[PDB]
UniProtKB/Swiss-Prot annotation:
Changing residue 29 to A: In strain: Mu/B.1.621. Inhibited in vitro by GRL-0617. It comes from Severe acute respiratory syndrome coronavirus 2 (2019-nCoV). It is found in: Host endoplasmic reticulum membrane. The chain holds residues 1027 to 1191 of 7096 of the full protein. Residues 1-165 form the Macro domain. Changing residue 162 to L: In strain: Gamma/P.1. It is a multi-pass membrane protein. This is Papain-like protease nsp3. The gene is rep. Signal peptide: none annotated. Responsible for the cleavages located at the N-terminus of the replicase polyprotein. Participates together with nsp4 in the assembly of virally-induced cytoplasmic double-membrane vesicles necessary for viral replication. Antagonizes innate immune induction of type I interferon by blocking the phosphorylation, dimerization and subsequent nuclear translocation of host IRF3. Also prevents host NF-kappa-B signaling. In addition, PL-PRO possesses a deubiquitinating/deISGylating activity and processes both 'Lys-48'- and 'Lys-63'-linked polyubiquitin chains from cellular substrates. It catalyses: Thiol-dependent hydrolysis of ester, thioester, amide, peptide and isopeptide bonds formed by the C-terminal Gly of ubiquitin (a 76-residue protein attached to proteins as an intracellular targeting signal). May form homohexamers. Interacts with N protein.
């Protein structure tokens, strides 16, 4: 199971970890991807998860988009977890750098409630441009299922824990 996490609340845990390494170690039922509406896994968490699957995530994602069209910002889809997890829940948080509504971050986190336990990154953090302290707050106030957050950056992890109310 999950090890080395700091408990923030009844259901939210956090660790300074590379989510790819964490997924390969735990092989959780669900790993969350910080997806975009096109499921183009170029960079950030998505680029790293996809690279760990040897591009199989991108091949599966392109077939999903060809059939279904793009996701909505705030939406998600369940696809294979490949070698990382049983499933990957691709969740689209708003990208502040694309001028997307930050209010959609709560809708994005609501997708996590359909899964009992998830390994996840902070939505809309990193290259998505939102404040990770705000993302953690929305996470704790929205997600009711068990979420194990992996924060890659040690300095950000320390800031998130030390400022957690
Ligand atoms: C790479 O991981 C999988 C791949 C395929 C499958 C069918 C399952 C997994 N996961 C897995 O077994 N996770 N788990 C969580 N709690 N007990 C077991």
């Amino acid at each position: 199971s999950f090890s080395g996490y700091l408990k923030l609340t009844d259901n939210v845990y956090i660790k300074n970890a590379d989510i790819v390494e964490e997924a390969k170690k735990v092989k959780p039922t669900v790993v969350v991807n910080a997806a975009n509406v096109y499921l183009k896994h170029g960079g950030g968490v998505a680029g790293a998860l996809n690279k760990a699957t040897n591009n199989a995530m991108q091949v599966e994602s392109d077939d999903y988009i060809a059939t279904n069209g793009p996701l909505k910002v705030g939406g998600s889809c369940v696809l294979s977890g490949h070698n990382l997890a049983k499933h990957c829940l691709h969740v689209v948080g708003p990208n502040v750098n694309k001028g997307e509504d930050i209010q959609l971050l709560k809708s994005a986190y609501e997708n996590f409630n359909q899964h009992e336990v998830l390994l996840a990154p902070l939505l809309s953090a990193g290259i998505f441009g939102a404040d990770p302290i705000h993302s953690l707050r929305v996470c704790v106030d929205t997600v009711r299922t068990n979420v194990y957050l992996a924060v890659f950056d040690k300095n950000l992890y320390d800031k998130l824990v030390s400022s957690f109310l």
